[PDB]
């Protein structure tokens, strides 16, 4: 009935295979520091470890599959805090215009640690655009990621 899904499960998984560059598959001060640092710098370590304990229910000091899924599945209809998605956007739009460009992204995607020529992205942004502007805006960004 649903055993043939594993679609969402596979999605998170890929996120762990992409975020975890070591091979353990867990969000830790290490994978967090490295990335977060290459995204917005990293102040101290004690603060990062304390921030992870304020959420780690068990105490492994890290996060696995159930805990991650739980971090998202565990929710409160409480007023939508788009501030999250919003912030995520700002990261993508580094400069400060609001829309994504071929060069802009290429810089953010290339810094993640992989190799994506200019063609791929170009084809990605294109499909993302249904009207015919050429660049991605907030409406298309929400209309595409929002699905329910």
């Amino acid at each position: 009935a649903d055993q043939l899904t594993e679609e969402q499960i596979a999605e998170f998984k890929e996120a762990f295979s992409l975020f975890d560059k070591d091979g353990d598959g867990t969000i830790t001060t290490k994978e967090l520091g490295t990335v977060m640092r290459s995204l917005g710098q990293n102040p101290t370590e004690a603060e990062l470890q304390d921030m992870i304990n304020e959420v780690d229910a068990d105490g492994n000091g890290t996060i696995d599959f159930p805990e991650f899924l739980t971090m998202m599945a565990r929710k409160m209809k409480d007023t939508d805090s788009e501030e999250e998605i919003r912030e995520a956007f700002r990261v993508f739009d580094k400069d400060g215009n609001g829309f994504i460009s071929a060069a802009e992204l290429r810089h953010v995607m290339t810094n993640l640690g992989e190799k994506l020529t200019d063609e791929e992205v170009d084809e990605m942004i294109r499909e993302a655009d249904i009207d015919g502007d050429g660049q991605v805006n907030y409406e298309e960004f929400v209309t595409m990621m929002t699905s329910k």
Binding site: E11, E14, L18, L39, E54, E87, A88, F92, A128, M144
Partner: peptide
């Protein structure tokens, strides 16, 4: 394929760990 999701979600994990800090106002 062209899923800005794994890319977004991923950043969502870290971005969330940055905001989890319940306002260090004090």
């Amino acid at each position: 394929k062209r899923r800005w999701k794994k890319n977004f979600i991923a950043v969502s994990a870290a971005n969330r760990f940055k905001k989890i800090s319940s306002s260090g106002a004090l």
